[PDB]
């Protein structure tokens, strides 16, 4: 019932009770753990209980649990549901729900900042142009000339599933990927397909190594449309090393604003299918994953070459030596250009502090170890030595099928 | 109910049916994952069924399932159990059992070598001195002058739980740890408690930074006894860097033979509480964990200074830079002295192949991602991108409480 989690580097022991309020499933069972698996409409009868769950926690959070207001709102929503077969969140609820969905994202290491989320209510939106306007405003607000601010823009909630809003891009800002004759790939391999759907839509690709993709926005169910983000609104950082002058020649750059746009925000049973959100990068995401993953920019060899390291034998750890340098470069560039960014050491230390805060103020903190521990230097960051309990709480952010695999043109 | 795992780097998908034969629990539920949690006498009534499942697996492995030999064996064990409340494994079954416990160890990345395990049967052992002799033989055989050979030594199984054989050391070879009155620790902090017990038992500690601990052996439930492993049998490697001549001046060294000696081996319901086994190191075990964990030798700072790294701010990644060097030094020193060792790229690549093979020939391979993925450069090794399923199969290696916490001292 009352689970305990130990930190093996400090011996600190936290007790978890928050998991008891868990509602969703984990993919795991008593006979099998699926902890490392990436991916393990509602009826009036399904909806009301969810709304109640939320409202009860919402009112409890504002110290008015079982108040007239609580009961009243509870009744009002109840009636609205039985009638409209759905409901609308007050603004106070939308904000609390979005913040808590971030608070509950077990895979996010940057949650110590959860309560500072800026919420942009775009529930009054009705067209791709409208969505494009909202997104440009989000980008400018969050980028803030390099002094990044976390934010989320919430489009109209789902109704019949045939009127859903969706941002086809996986992130507001990403580089294109094209399959060349060589069989190899130009640009970002992860976006090879989307890069094609755009073209399949009319996008004139500059066919470069770092071409900012165009937004493909879908509103009210209609087919999606393209829009190019004002270049002046896309902050970029040219990647250079603080010692290897040749580094600049590698021709590398990345965008400063990471903004996941393909997820689904769930609040009180209501589903928001278009809810792009952004914060700021942890160095390793770019330097380790985007730059060194074999199926991404896969740039380790080149950097190793330029460093003239013995690539004859894996035991010389050239891949490792280079990995470190590349990552030092990213953090150095961003910092040099005063663009917000956090290193994995500082980010992981903050998460540990945040976990302690959450354990003493909330009785727990769902966390997915597999995602929290950085892709490099795992054990020299404190989270590696931190036992974590993963469970699903609502409100939450959930994965959802790529629209192009569901859209009925 | 089939289950598929995908490798997000190669899009290769494998199907697992093996998990269906999993009986033990995981610690997880439909509502919570305890995947990153370190640690989540039998009766006749429960023993025979365990023995049978085991014998059924063994006879199938040798293609004699349902044979007369199979039936007679079941009948014999059955009789032996009702007769004596337990039973003895044949030599063949023991070897098969030991190899499969290794094959089933979800946290071991070296399993591609599972079938080549050398099994030493020490079930006729009756005393601590006898245990010491078996252990010395295991160390010399396994060490093989630097050309390491995997091996396991199996002492008498548990009976009533009051006559257990136990190796009190956590590894056959390990360095002493000493807490100083000024609060600092000399040697390996991981072994301070055990070191105290040794001193209390009579061990005259030299009190240096790399003193090989004495063996503390318990036979037949008796009080444990101390024994010094002949130094000539303990292979050690002085650590030096291929480009930094000052590295040798850190005065670091490590032993060449890693031999976990505190786990419990379960086979067909039988419990082997003293079953020390050994393989060869993966570089990062020493270089990342033993040397750089804040709670182990914790050498990152000192190595950082010597490299004149910008230690003013973490974003300089001076810890990361120094970590790589230390691990390069460990691999280099070992290879130079021709002592078997495997780097994490090589070991993880081998585990991926092993895993794929296992899915194809066995229907799966239980694996603990949290433990399989190396402590440094996680994503540049293929295991990071590999989805894995973790479940418990028997035979298996299990954790057991430290004996000093359960032993009834006799005096
Ligand atoms: C402000 C700084 C932030 C930092 C430093 C941070 C860091 C991270 C990191 C390192 C990951 C893993 C990314 C990956 O491997 O692809 C992650 C995942 C995630 N974060 Fe954040 N985050 C921040 C803000 C946000 C915000 C504002 C939200 C939502 C409102 C959020 C929601 C999540 C979710 C749901 C995931 C998992 C996404 C997935 O499954 O792909 N994060 N974050
Ligand atoms: C031959 C080379 C071998 C290599 C390279 C290898 C590698 C590894 C590594 C790197 C770990 C993680 C250790 C840690 O983090 O403390 C591990 C764990 C494990 N290995 Fe091996 N191994 C080998 C042989 C063996 C043998 C011979 C057995 C059994 C007969 C075995 C059983 C296990 C077990 C049960 C664990 C988990 C131990 C624990 O929970 O503390 N391994 N192995
Ligand atoms: C298969 C495995 O789950 C997968 O590679 C995971 C591992 N940990 C991760 N951790 C983070 N933060 N992000 C990821 O994309 C992944 N990928
Ligand atoms: C808390 C966390 O489970 C713990 O630090 C684990 C993580 N992965 C590990 N992996 C290996 N190989 N060895 C370990 O000791 C650990 N420790
Ligand atoms: N820090 C963040 N908000 N990250 C969001 C995910 C970005 C993704 N990991 C990338 O490197 O492109
Ligand atoms: N490869 C092995 N057999 N390892 C056994 C465990 C050794 C332990 N991790 C150590 O660093 O001492
Ligand atoms: Zn699990």
- DSSP one-letter string for A230-272: -GGG--EEE---SS-GGGGGG--EEES---B-S-EEEETTEEE
Q: Is residue A379 part of a domain?
A: no
CB pairs under 8 A between A and B: 209
Please tell me whether residues A227 and A142 are part of one structural domain.
Answer: yes
- Does residue A273 sit in helix, strand or coil? coil
Q: Are B241 and B253 in contact (CB under 8 A)?
A: no
- Does residue A364 sit in helix, strand or coil? coil
The helix or strand, by DSSP H or E, that contains position A133, with its residue range, turns out to be: helix A128-143
Q: How far apart (Å, rounded) are the C-alpha atoms in residues A71 and A78? A: 10
Closest to A108 in 3D by CA, of A351, A346, A331, A377: A351
What distance lies between CA A7 and its chain's CA centroid?
26
Q: How far apart (Å, rounded) are the C-alpha atoms in residues B34 and A200? A: 45
Q: Are A344 and A286 in contact (CB under 8 A)?
A: no
* A29·B26 Cβ contact <8 A: yes
Residues after which chain B has a gap (C–N > 2.5 Å): 40
Structure tokens given for B49: 């069924």
Q: Is the CB of A118 under 6 A from ligand 1?
A: no
CA B22, B28, B34, B40 torsion-angle sign: negative
Of all protein residues, the one whose alpha carbon is nearest to atom 37 of ligand 2 is B107
Q: How far apart (Å, rounded) are the C-alpha atoms in residues B63 and A409? A: 58
β-sheet bridge partners, residue A48: none
A161 conformational bin, left if phi > 0, alpha if psi -120 to 50, beta if neither: left
Q: Are strands A151-154 and A118-121 parallel, antiparallel or unpaired?
A: parallel
Q: Which residue has the tokens 């759907």?
A: A197
Q: Are B277 and B151 in contact (CB under 8 A)?
A: yes
> How many other β-carbons are positioned within 10 Å of the β-carbon of residue B358?
21
Q: How far apart (Å, rounded) are the C-alpha atoms in residues A185 and A176? A: 10
Q: Which residue has the tokens 């994965």?
A: A399
- Does residue A143 sit in helix, strand or coil? helix
CA B113, B384, A252, A180 torsion-angle sign: positive
Q: Is residue B336 part of a domain?
A: yes
Task: Write down the number of H helices and E strands in chain A.
Answer: 11, 15
Q: Is residue B272 part of a domain?
A: yes
Q: How far apart (Å, rounded) are the C-alpha atoms in residues B12 and A64? A: 53
Structure tokens given for B384: 């990071």
End-to-end Cα distance, chain B = 55
Q: How far apart (Å, rounded) are the C-alpha atoms in residues B236 and B247? A: 17
- Does residue A136 sit in helix, strand or coil? helix
Please tell me whether residues B79 and B191 are part of one structural domain.
Answer: no
B263 conformational bin, left if phi > 0, alpha if psi -120 to 50, beta if neither: beta
* B29·A33 Cβ contact <8 A: no
The whole domain housing A329 covers 236-258+281-346
Catalytic residues of A: 108, 111, 280, 285
What distance in angstroms lies between residue A215's CA and the mean position of ligand 5's atoms? 17
β-sheet bridge partners, residue B398: B264
- Does residue A329 sit in helix, strand or coil? helix
Name the experiment that determined this structure.
Answer: X-ray
Exposed, middle or buried: residue A407 (CB in 10 Å: 0-12, 13-18, 19+)?
middle
End-to-end Cα distance, chain A = 49
β-sheet bridge partners, residue A7: A386
Please tell me whether residues A339 and A287 are part of one structural domain.
Answer: yes
Please tell me whether residues A209 and A271 are part of one structural domain.
Answer: no
- DSSP one-letter string for A11-42: --EEEE-GGGG--S--S-BTTBB-TT-S----
Structure tokens given for A270: 């209501």
Exposed, middle or buried: residue B39 (CB in 10 Å: 0-12, 13-18, 19+)?
exposed
Q: How far apart (Å, rounded) are the C-alpha atoms in residues A334 and A221? A: 39
Q: How far apart (Å, rounded) are the C-alpha atoms in residues B54 and B93? A: 9
Smallest Cα distance from B35 to chain A, Å: 6
Smallest Cα distance from A139 to chain B, Å: 26
- What's the CA angle centered on B247, arms B246 and B252, to 5 degrees? 135
Q: Is residue B378 part of a domain?
A: no
Structure tokens given for B280: 């060869």
Alpha carbon separation from B225 to A8, A364, A393, B194, B409 (Å, rounded): 30, 45, 53, 13, 12
Q: Are B371 and B7 in contact (CB under 8 A)?
A: no
Please tell me whether residues A229 and A178 are part of one structural domain.
Answer: yes
What distance lies between CA A150 and its chain's CA centroid?
11
Q: Ligand 1 atom closest to Cα of A342?
A: 5
Q: Is residue B394 part of a domain?
A: no
Closest to A26 in 3D by CA, of A399, A391, A398: A391
Closest to B261 in 3D by CA, of B381, B144, B80, B138: B138
Structure tokens given for B276: 């020390």
Report the CATH number at residue A223.
Answer: 3.90.440.10
Q: Domain count of chain B?
A: 3
* B9·A319 Cβ contact <8 A: no
Closest to B108 in 3D by CA, of B372, B350, B383: B372
Q: Nearest residue on chain A to B390, judged by CA atoms? A: A33
Longest dimension (CA), chain B: 74
β-sheet bridge partners, residue B177: B187
β-sheet bridge partners, residue A111: none
Please tell me whether residues B29 and B118 are part of one structural domain.
Answer: yes
Of all protein residues, the one whose alpha carbon is nearest to atom 18 of ligand 2 is B108
* B32·A22 Cβ contact <8 A: yes
Please tell me whether residues B193 and B316 are part of one structural domain.
Answer: no
Q: Are A106 and A392 in contact (CB under 8 A)?
A: yes
Please tell me whether residues A207 and A115 are part of one structural domain.
Answer: no
Alpha carbon separation from B252 to B243, B256, B291 (Å, rounded): 16, 13, 9
Select the residue from B242, B296, B371, B380 to test the A interface by mutation, using most A Cβ atoms within 10 A: B380
Q: Which residue has the tokens 């499933």?
A: A25
Q: Are strands A215-218 and A166-167 parallel, antiparallel or unpaired?
A: antiparallel
Exposed, middle or buried: residue B301 (CB in 10 Å: 0-12, 13-18, 19+)?
middle
* B328·A316 Cβ contact <8 A: yes
Q: Is the CB of A260 under 6 A from ligand 5?
A: yes
Q: Is residue A213 part of a domain?
A: yes
Length of chain A equals: 409
Q: Are B304 and B318 in contact (CB under 8 A)?
A: yes
The helix or strand, by DSSP H or E, that contains position A156, with its residue range, turns out to be: none
What distance in angstroms lies between residue A29's CA and the mean position of ligand 7's atoms? 7
Please tell me whether residues B190 and B273 are part of one structural domain.
Answer: no
Longest dimension (CA), chain A: 74
The helix or strand, by DSSP H or E, that contains position A323, with its residue range, turns out to be: helix A318-336
Which positions in chain A touch B35 (Cβ < 8 Å)? 28, 33, 35-36, 369-370, 390
Q: Spell out the SS3 assignment of chain B.
A: CCEEEEECCCCEEEEECHHHHCCCCCCCCCCCECCCCCCCCCCHHHHHHHHHHHHHHHHHHCCCCCCHHHHHHHHHHHHHHHHHCCCCCCHHHHHHHHHHHHHHCCCCCCHHHHHHCEEEECCCCCCHHHHHHHHHHHHHHHHHHHCCCCEEEECCCCCCCCCCCEECCCECCCECEEECCCCCEEECHHHHHHHHHHHHCCCCCCCCCCCECCEEEECCCCCCEEECCCHHHCCEEECCCCCCCCHHHHCCEEECCCCECCCEEEECCEEECCCCEECCEEHHHHHHHHHHCCCCCCCHHHHHHHCCCCCCCHHHCHHHHHHHHHHHHHHHHHHHCCCCEECHHHHHHHHHHHHHHHHHHHCCCCCCHHHHCCCCCHHHCHHHHECCCECCCCCEEECCCCHHHCCCCCC
- CA contacts within 13 A on the Cβ side of B31: 10
> How many other β-carbons are positioned within 10 Å of the β-carbon of residue A200?
10
Q: Nearest residue on chain A to B33, judged by CA atoms? A: A390
Please tell me whether residues B104 and B202 are part of one structural domain.
Answer: no
Closest to B76 in 3D by CA, of B84, B395, B95: B84
Smallest Cα distance from B205 to chain A, Å: 26
The helix or strand, by DSSP H or E, that contains position A139, with its residue range, turns out to be: helix A128-143
Of all protein residues, the one whose alpha carbon is nearest to atom 9 of ligand 1 is A108
Q: For residues A91, A92, A95 and A97, what is the CA-based torsion angle, rounded to 10 degrees?
A: -110
Q: Of A331, A346, A361, which residue sits at a domain end?
A: A346
Q: Exposure string (b/e) for B69-92, b if CB count within 10 Å is 16 or more?
A: ebeebbeebbeebeeeebbebeee
| Helical axes B68-84 vs B44-61, angle rounded to 10° | 160
Contacts of A118 (CB under 8 A, 6+ apart): A141, A142, A149, A150, A151, A152
Q: Is residue A2 part of a domain?
A: no
Q: Spell out the SS3 assignment of A44-107.
A: HHHHHHHHHHHHHHHHHHCCCCCCHHHHHHHHHHHHHHHHHCCCCCCHHHHHHHHHHHHHCCCC
Q: Are B209 and B251 in contact (CB under 8 A)?
A: yes
Contacts of B113 (CB under 8 A, 6+ apart): B150, B279
Smallest Cα distance from B5 to chain A, Å: 7
Closest to B297 in 3D by CA, of B179, B188, B209: B188
Which positions in chain B touch A377 (Cβ < 8 Å)? 319-320, 323, 376-377
Please tell me whether residues B243 and B180 are part of one structural domain.
Answer: no
Q: How far apart (Å, rounded) are the C-alpha atoms in residues B78 and A266? A: 57
Q: Which residue has the tokens 């939106």?
A: A125
Q: Is residue A387 part of a domain?
A: no
* A345·B31 Cβ contact <8 A: no
What distance in angstroms lies between residue B343's CA and the mean position of ligand 2's atoms? 14
A102-106, Cβ contacts within 8 angstroms, sequence gap of 24 or more: A102/A152, A102/A277, A102/A397, A104/A366, A104/A392, A104/A393, A104/A394, A104/A395, A104/A396, A105/A396, A105/A397, A106/A366, A106/A367, A106/A368, A106/A371, A106/A390, A106/A391, A106/A392
Q: Spell out the SS3 assignment of A168-192.
A: CCCECCCECEEECCCCCEEECHHHH
Q: Which of A95, A96, A97, A107 best tests ligand 1's pocket when mutated (most atoms within 8 Å of CB)?
A: A107
Report the CATH number at residue B28.
Answer: 3.90.340.10
Structure tokens given for A100: 């808590």
Structure tokens given for A128: 């791709």
Q: Which of B107, B171, B262, B275 best tests ligand 6's pocket when mutated (most atoms within 8 Å of CB)?
A: B171
Report the CATH number at residue A316.
Answer: 3.90.1230.10
- Does residue A285 sit in helix, strand or coil? helix
Q: How far apart (Å, rounded) are the C-alpha atoms in residues A265 and A275? A: 6
Length of chain B equals: 411
| Helical axes B318-336 vs A318-336, angle rounded to 10° | 170
**Closest Cβ opposite residue A319 in set B368, B373, B380:** B380
* B8·A38 Cβ contact <8 A: yes
Please tell me whether residues A26 and A155 are part of one structural domain.
Answer: yes
């Amino acid at each position: 019932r009352f689970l305990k989690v130990k930190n093996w580097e400090t011996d600190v022991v936290l007790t978890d009770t928050l998991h008891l309020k868990s509602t969703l499933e984990t993919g795991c069972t008593e006979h099998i753990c699926m902890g490392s698996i990436m991916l393990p409409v509602r009826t009036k009868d399904q909806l009301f209980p969810l709304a109640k769950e939320f409202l009860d926690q919402y009112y409890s959070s504002i110290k008015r649990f079982g108040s007239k207001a609580h009961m009243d709102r509870l009744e009002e929503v109840n009636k609205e549901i039985e009638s409209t077969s759905t409901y609308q969140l007050k603004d106070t609820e939308l904000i609390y729900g979005a913040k808590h969905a971030w608070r509950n994202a077990s895979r996010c290491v940057g949650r110590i900042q959860w309560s500072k989320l800026q919420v942009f209510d775009a529930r009054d939106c009705t067209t791709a142009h409208g969505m494009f306007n909202y997104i440009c405003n989000h980008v400018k607000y969050a980028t803030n000339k390099g002094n990044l601010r976390s934010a989320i823009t919430i489009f109209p909630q789902r109704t019949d599933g045939k009127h859903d809003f969706r941002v086809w891009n996986s992130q507001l800002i990403r580089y294109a990927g094209y399959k060349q004759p060589d069989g190899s790939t130009l640009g970002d391999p992860a976006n090879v397909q989307f890069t094609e759907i755009c073209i399949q839509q009319g996008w004139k690709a500059p066919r470069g190594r770092f071409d900012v993709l165009p937004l493909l926005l879908q509103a009210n169910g209609n087919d999606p449309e393209l829009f190019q983000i004002p270049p002046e609104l896309v902050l970029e950082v040219p990647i250079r090393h603080p010692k290897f002058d040749w580094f600049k020649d590698l021709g590398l750059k990345w965008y400063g604003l990471p903004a996941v746009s393909n997820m689904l925000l769930e609040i009180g049973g209501l589903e928001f299918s278009a809810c792009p959100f952004s914060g700021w990068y942890m160095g390793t995401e770019i330097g380790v994953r985007d730059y060194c993953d074999n199926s991404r920019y896969n740039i380790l060899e080149e950097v190793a070459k330029k460093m003239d390291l013995d690539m004859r034998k894996t035991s010389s750890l050239w891949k490792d030596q280079a990995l470190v340098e590349i990552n030092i470069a990213v953090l150095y560039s961003f910092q040099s250009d005063k663009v917000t960014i956090v290193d994995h050491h500082s980010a992981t230390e903050s998460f540990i502090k945040h976990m302690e805060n959450e354990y003493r103020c909330r009785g727990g903190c769902p966390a997915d170890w597999v995602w929290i521990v950085p892709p490099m230097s795992g054990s020299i960051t404190p989270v590696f030595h931190q036992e974590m309990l993963n469970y699903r709480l609502t409100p939450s952010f959930e994965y959802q099928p790529d629209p192009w695999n569901t859209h009925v043109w």
